Amino acid sequence: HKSEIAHRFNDLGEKHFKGLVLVAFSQYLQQCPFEDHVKLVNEVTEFAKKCAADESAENCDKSLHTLFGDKLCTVATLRATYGELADCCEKQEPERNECFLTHKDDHPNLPKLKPEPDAQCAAFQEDPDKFLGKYLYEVARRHPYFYGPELLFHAEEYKADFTECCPADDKLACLIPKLDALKERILLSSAKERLKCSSFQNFGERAVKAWSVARLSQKFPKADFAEVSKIVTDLTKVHKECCHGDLLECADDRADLAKYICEHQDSISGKLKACCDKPLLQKSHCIAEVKEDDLPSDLPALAADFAEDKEICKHYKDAKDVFLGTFLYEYSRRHPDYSVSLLLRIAKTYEATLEKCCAEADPPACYRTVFDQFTPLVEEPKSLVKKNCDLFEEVGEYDFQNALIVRYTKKAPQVSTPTLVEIGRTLGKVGSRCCKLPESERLPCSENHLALALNRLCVLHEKTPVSEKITKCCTDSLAERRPCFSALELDEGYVPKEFKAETFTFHADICTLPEDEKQIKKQSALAELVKHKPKATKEQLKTVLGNFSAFVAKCCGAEDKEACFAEEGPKLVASSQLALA
Ligand SMILES: C[C@H](C(=O)O)c1cccc(C(=O)c2ccccc2)c1
Numbered sequence: 001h002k003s004e005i006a007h008r009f010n011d012l013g014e015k016h017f018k019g020l021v022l023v024a025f026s027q028y029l030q031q032c033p034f035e036d037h038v039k040l041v042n043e044v045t046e047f048a049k050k051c052a053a054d055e056s057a058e059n060c061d062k063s064l065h066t067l068f069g070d071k072l073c074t075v076a077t078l079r080a081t082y083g084e085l086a087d088c089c090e091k092q093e094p095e096r097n098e099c100f101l102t103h104k105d106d107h108p109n110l111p112k113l114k115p116e117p118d119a120q121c122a123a124f125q126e127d128p129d130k131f132l133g134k135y136l137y138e139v140a141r142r143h144p145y146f147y148g149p150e151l152l153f154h155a156e157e158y159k160a161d162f163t164e165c166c167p168a169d170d171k172l173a174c175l176i177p178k179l180d181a182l183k184e185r186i187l188l189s190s191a192k193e194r195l196k197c198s199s200f201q202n203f204g205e206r207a208v209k210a211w212s213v214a215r216l217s218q219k220f221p222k223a224d225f226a227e228v229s230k231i232v233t234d235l236t237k238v239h240k241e242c243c244h245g246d247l248l249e250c251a252d253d254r255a256d257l258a259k260y261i262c263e264h265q266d267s268i269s270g271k272l273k274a275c276c277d278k279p280l281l282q283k284s285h286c287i288a289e290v291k292e293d294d295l296p297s298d299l300p301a302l303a304a305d306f307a308e309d310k311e312i313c314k315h316y317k318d319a320k321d322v323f324l325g326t327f328l329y330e331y332s333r334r335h336p337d338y339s340v341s342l343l344l345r346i347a348k349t350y351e352a353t354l355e356k357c358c359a360e361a362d363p364p365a366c367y368r369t370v371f372d373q374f375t376p377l378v379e380e381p382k383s384l385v386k387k388n389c390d391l392f393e394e395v396g397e398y399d400f401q402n403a404l405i406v407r408y409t410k411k412a413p414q415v416s417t418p419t420l421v422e423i424g425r426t427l428g429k430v431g432s433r434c435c436k437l438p439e440s441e442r443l444p445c446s447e448n449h450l451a452l453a454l455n456r457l458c459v460l461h462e463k464t465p466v467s468e469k470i471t472k473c474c475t476d477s478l479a480e481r482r483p484c485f486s487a488l489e490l491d492e493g494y495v496p497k498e499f500k501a502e503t504f505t506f507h508a509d510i511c512t513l514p515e516d517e518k519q520i521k522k523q524s525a526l527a528e529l530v531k532h533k534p535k536a537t538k539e540q541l542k543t544v545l546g547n548f549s550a551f552v553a554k555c556c557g558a559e560d561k562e563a564c565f566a567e568e569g570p571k572l573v574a575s576s577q578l579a580l581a
């Protein structure tokens, strides 16, 4: 391949090429308007077309990193708007691309995307290509680590909605509950992918491989070790490329893997039939979200190879990577009822037991009971899910969220109120999605979603560290994160936050808000109560938050709303300090 840009343009096609180039530049240049990005994509596409025609032509032989970085570094007002990226532009490759990746702005703090059914249908009918382009741009610049090919698929779902609802007489009623649905899927898809890039960033490639082996083995328990290894190998390279901004290489390798899985469908899973008779982007997405295959009847007993065999210490010392790899593969297949992080905890415990037993006088008598060391690792998560799902089913999403906000504020009262509310709210919505499932599917649903919310929190903590306890849980071990976070207790060294009257002061503006923005104001007050009175019992806090809810409802239903807030507000504040003693 003489011209790498021609190669990728030839393989991907103009439509997807333009999309992936837009995403690539949007994820870095988050402040630059859409119009300006379009002009940048047009110039890049023109260069690809020229190179596709004559591969010996000017600068066509240069690397994709060279061409990308050179182009990024020609953008108007770079030093002023993107001072960090501007410093990278001094450097040669591969140092320059490495600098770009380091200084990629994680949370840009742009306004929330509000659907405009009338204006967006108009823009869509006017020019749909540009309308889809704008969607890629808006999502890419808000989620800088979003997988290029996956975002193209979400753009198709976005398109499908707007083709279906714009013809309809009523638009708002048609689009909002679909665009609300699409926004959740974007948040989850973005979160899953941020965990993969975070895992690479924080724990390296060996951790991503072990996670993938565990997950694919659960999804494809029919597949043999050599098949899982092949998929994990190819998928890791895909994940590495997409996470490191190599969208063109990534889109191509992802398409190839999807083509391989579907060609070898019969020996991988019987659930891939639906996925494999679909178009390109829909196929890849379907495989990624595919239901776990039925357990094979012929899954082998593991006690013989991993507990009873007299030469395991020999197998461990000599054939280590294969032996531990085979264990993780085999143990994962037979436990779709376990979370990925639980399976990696069990693997780490298997290894640790072999280290100990194989250093001592009679190893076989020692490691014979290795499987029984897993029992505690399975019960701790199973109990917390049973316990939290009982609470959720009793009190509902709102009070469950409030329960979690109190729990975490007490664990980490140094963390900002918005973050505490966001995390407690998110893990509340986990209760809503997961607790209503069959009891066996709860733990994986819960602890896998917990991994997404904890990764979120750990990314915010990189931006603004507040707690050494949090830094340790976030950086020490991927497998041990949730346990480490669960282990945290109320820091007895913490100084109760100085009481600001203004903090618990409410006005009539609260009454016009939708129900969830109302909740957030009160949930923000709950966090502030725990911050001022952290030794207050969970029951004391439930009482006071009740008084705040009663007060808001009373004054929002008043003749003079502002006179009610102004009169009753200070009284509620004063009595609450005494109630939380
Ligand atoms: C509007 C402009 C164009 O089309 O010149 C443009 C610039 C960049 C990306 C894209 C796209 O993603 C896209 C989406 C659907 C069809 C074709 C392109 C489109």
Ligand SMILES: C[C@H](C(=O)O)c1cccc(C(=O)c2ccccc2)c1
Pocket (backbone or CB within 6 Å): 005, 020, 021, 024, 044, 047, 063, 064, 065, 067, 068, 069, 071, 245, 246, 247, 248, 249
């Ligand atoms: C690095 C990244 C990728 O490898 O996916 C990427 C994204 C978009 C475009 C290009 C280019 O090769 C390019 C070509 C000409 C001008 C500007 C960029 C490269």
Ligand SMILES: C[C@H](C(=O)O)c1cccc(C(=O)c2ccccc2)c1
Pocket (backbone or CB within 6 Å): 391, 395, 399, 400, 402, 403, 404, 406, 407, 538, 539, 541, 542, 543, 545
């Ligand atoms: C209802 C139940 C109880 O009190 O035994 C319970 C269990 C767990 C946590 C909490 C809370 O902290 C809480 C605080 C305010 C509102 C809602 C829940 C309450």
Ligand SMILES: CCCCCCCCC(=O)O
Pocket (backbone or CB within 6 Å): 407, 408, 411, 412, 415, 423, 450, 457, 470, 482, 485, 486
């Ligand atoms: C700083 C926020 C702490 C969040 C801990 C979440 C762990 C899950 C739990 O045990 O509830």
